[PDB]
Enzyme design. Structure first.
Site, PDB file in Angstrom:
ATOM      1  N   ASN A 126       7.525  34.703  -4.494  1.00 61.08           N
ATOM      2  CA  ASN A 126       6.410  34.174  -3.719  1.00 61.08           C
ATOM      3  C   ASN A 126       5.285  35.208  -3.747  1.00 61.08           C
ATOM      4  OD1 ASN A 126       4.611  33.488  -1.590  1.00 61.08           O
ATOM      5  ND2 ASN A 126       6.192  32.142  -0.751  1.00 61.08           N
ATOM      6  N   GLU A 186       9.322  43.720  -4.898  1.00 57.12           N
ATOM      7  CA  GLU A 186       8.081  43.933  -5.630  1.00 57.12           C
ATOM      8  C   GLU A 186       7.853  45.398  -5.972  1.00 57.12           C
ATOM      9  OE1 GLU A 186       8.222  42.457  -2.610  1.00 57.12           O
ATOM     10  OE2 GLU A 186       7.272  40.477  -2.711  1.00 57.12           O
ATOM     11  N   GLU A 196       7.967  39.719  -8.521  1.00 59.27           N
ATOM     12  CA  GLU A 196       7.447  38.694  -7.626  1.00 59.27           C
ATOM     13  C   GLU A 196       8.229  37.392  -7.720  1.00 59.27           C
ATOM     14  OE1 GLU A 196       5.424  38.809  -5.310  1.00 59.27           O
ATOM     15  OE2 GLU A 196       3.662  40.054  -5.677  1.00 59.27           O
ATOM     16  N   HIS A 239      -8.045  36.657 -22.999  1.00 58.37           N
ATOM     17  CA  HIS A 239      -8.990  35.974 -22.111  1.00 58.37           C
ATOM     18  C   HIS A 239      -8.722  36.281 -20.636  1.00 58.37           C
ATOM     19  CE1 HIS A 239      -5.915  32.642 -21.778  1.00 58.37           C
ATOM     20  NE2 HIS A 239      -6.446  32.527 -20.571  1.00 58.37           N
ATOM     21  N   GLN A 245      -3.895  25.964 -15.998  1.00 58.67           N
ATOM     22  CA  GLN A 245      -4.726  27.056 -15.510  1.00 58.67           C
ATOM     23  C   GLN A 245      -3.963  27.893 -14.489  1.00 58.67           C
ATOM     24  OE1 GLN A 245      -6.552  28.740 -12.141  1.00 58.67           O
ATOM     25  NE2 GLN A 245      -7.911  28.355 -13.896  1.00 58.67           N
ATOM     26  N   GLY A 246      -4.090  29.211 -14.611  1.00 55.28           N
ATOM     27  CA  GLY A 246      -3.319  30.124 -13.810  1.00 55.28           C
ATOM     28  C   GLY A 246      -2.036  30.585 -14.461  1.00 55.28           C
ATOM     29  N   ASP A 300       3.720  20.743 -19.155  1.00 48.49           N
ATOM     30  CA  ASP A 300       2.791  21.643 -19.839  1.00 48.49           C
ATOM     31  C   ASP A 300       2.546  22.865 -18.962  1.00 48.49           C
ATOM     32  OD1 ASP A 300       1.072  22.518 -21.856  1.00 48.49           O
ATOM     33  OD2 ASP A 300      -0.472  21.010 -21.468  1.00 48.49           O
ATOM     34  N   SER A 301       2.037  23.932 -19.580  1.00 47.79           N
ATOM     35  CA  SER A 301       1.434  24.987 -18.782  1.00 47.79           C
ATOM     36  C   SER A 301       0.013  24.564 -18.396  1.00 47.79           C
ATOM     37  CB  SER A 301       1.451  26.322 -19.532  1.00 47.79           C
ATOM     38  OG  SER A 301       0.869  26.197 -20.818  1.00 47.79           O
ATOM     39  N   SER A 329      -2.140  31.270 -17.687  1.00 52.23           N
ATOM     40  CA  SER A 329      -2.719  32.093 -18.747  1.00 52.23           C
ATOM     41  C   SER A 329      -2.067  33.454 -18.813  1.00 52.23           C
ATOM     42  CB  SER A 329      -4.214  32.325 -18.491  1.00 52.23           C
ATOM     43  OG  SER A 329      -4.964  31.169 -18.675  1.00 52.23           O
ATOM     44  N   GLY A 330      -1.766  33.892 -20.038  1.00 52.93           N
ATOM     45  CA  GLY A 330      -1.248  35.225 -20.257  1.00 52.93           C
ATOM     46  C   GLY A 330       0.246  35.355 -20.092  1.00 52.93           C
ATOM     47  N   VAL A 382       3.858  36.446  -0.143  1.00 52.34           N
ATOM     48  CA  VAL A 382       4.755  37.029   0.844  1.00 52.34           C
ATOM     49  C   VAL A 382       5.444  38.238   0.219  1.00 52.34           C
ATOM     50  CG1 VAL A 382       6.791  36.625   2.306  1.00 52.34           C
ATOM     51  CG2 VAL A 382       5.129  34.762   1.915  1.00 52.34           C
ATOM     52  N   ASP A 426      -5.663  35.980 -29.252  1.00 50.76           N
ATOM     53  CA  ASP A 426      -5.732  36.013 -27.783  1.00 50.76           C
ATOM     54  C   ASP A 426      -4.552  36.818 -27.229  1.00 50.76           C
ATOM     55  OD1 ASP A 426      -6.517  35.538 -25.186  1.00 50.76           O
ATOM     56  OD2 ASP A 426      -5.851  33.452 -25.168  1.00 50.76           O
TER      57      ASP A 426
HETATM   58  N1  LIG Z   1      -2.567  22.780 -21.388  1.00 49.69           N
HETATM   59  C1  LIG Z   1      -2.307  24.045 -21.415  1.00 49.69           C
HETATM   60  N2  LIG Z   1      -1.154  24.503 -21.934  1.00 49.69           N
HETATM   61  C2  LIG Z   1      -3.250  25.054 -20.873  1.00 49.69           C
HETATM   62  C3  LIG Z   1      -4.525  24.676 -20.462  1.00 49.69           C
HETATM   63  C4  LIG Z   1      -5.408  25.607 -19.953  1.00 49.69           C
HETATM   64  C5  LIG Z   1      -5.015  26.922 -19.859  1.00 49.69           C
HETATM   65 BR1  LIG Z   1      -6.237  28.193 -19.154  1.00 49.69          BR
HETATM   66  C6  LIG Z   1      -3.765  27.333 -20.266  1.00 49.69           C
HETATM   67  C7  LIG Z   1      -2.884  26.394 -20.771  1.00 49.69           C
HETATM   68 CA   LIG Z   2       6.029  38.595  -3.137  1.00 48.23          CA
END
Ligand SMILES: N=C(N)c1ccc(Br)cc1
Ligand SMILES: [Ca+2]
Length: 223
Positions: A54, A62, A52, A40, A174-175, A171-172, A177-178, A57, A84
């Site tokens: 920061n 890097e 990386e 995704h 948004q951002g 938890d993980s 991802s992957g 910066v 996925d």
């Molecule tokens: N709650 C989570 N672990 C999660 C939610 C949205 C996204 Br995009 C990735 C992970």
């Molecule tokens: Ca950097």
């Protein structure tokens, strides 16, 4: 990452940032020329950023390398997020060192109860948004298949596992991802999805990398 801690610069040397003018996804370096991420996260025009901490910066460790090819899993389903996973080949090989290093693929699947490390530059709040500039870390256990299926009835396939805390708060998000889920020094998961972030009874759902080792190895050997 919600409820995590600041990793420390270059303590997660396999973590990559995918950049298309801005950070949009994480990934994991699996050898000097290949990155694994979530399907995704696919888009064209990806620059891979290694070494990386920061991401706003230039700090000196890097390496910035454009992608030459992306390969989404042939059976990826964007409605269910089954399968996925995606591979990205770098236009040139990274220079590996103590701060830029690959992570090994697993030889077996990790069991529920195993403690893992999840990392990323994603949102740190469960309500509202606050994006950190330095890499965040979270230690979390793999949950049993039964607790995972009870949290998300009808939505967990054999290619997914849950990790985190049913109480919420960690938890993980948004951002993230992957990005990687690493257990006992092997890549066991990819940050995939969840309902909100850090909500009670809604743990994170992760792509089960051990199911894909044969596809990864065959694809890398032929591309
Ligand atoms: N709650 C989570 N672990 C999660 C939610 C949205 C996204 Br995009 C990735 C992970
Ligand atoms: Ca950097």
């Amino acid at each position: 990452i919600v409820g995590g801690y600041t990793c420390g610069a270059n303590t997660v040397p396999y973590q990559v940032s995918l950049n298309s003018g801005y950070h949009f996804c994480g990934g994991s370096l699996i050898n000097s020329q290949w990155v694994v991420s979530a399907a995704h996260c696919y888009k064209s025009g990806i620059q891979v950023r290694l070494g990386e901490d920061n991401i706003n910066v230039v700090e000196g460790n890097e390496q910035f390398i454009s992608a030459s090819k992306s390969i989404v899993h042939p059976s990826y389903n964007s409605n269910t997020l089954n399968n996925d996973i995606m591979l990205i080949k770098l236009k040139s090989a990274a220079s590996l060192n103590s701060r830029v290093a690959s992570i090994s693929l697993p030889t077996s699947c990790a069991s529920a109860g195993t403690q893992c490390l999840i990392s990323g530059w994603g949102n740190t709040k469960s309500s509202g948004t606050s994006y950190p500039d330095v890499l965040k870390c979270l230690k979390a256990p793999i949950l049993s298949d039964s607790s995972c299926k009870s949290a998300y009835p009808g939505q967990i396939t054999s290619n997914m596992f849950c990790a985190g805390y049913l109480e919420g708060g960690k938890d993980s998000c948004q951002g993230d991802s992957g990005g990687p889920v690493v257990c006992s020094g092997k890549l066991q998961g990819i940050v995939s999805w969840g309902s909100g972030c850090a909500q009670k009874n809604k743990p994170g759902v992760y792509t089960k990398v051990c199911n894909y080792v044969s596809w990864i190895k065959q694809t890398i050997a032929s591309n």
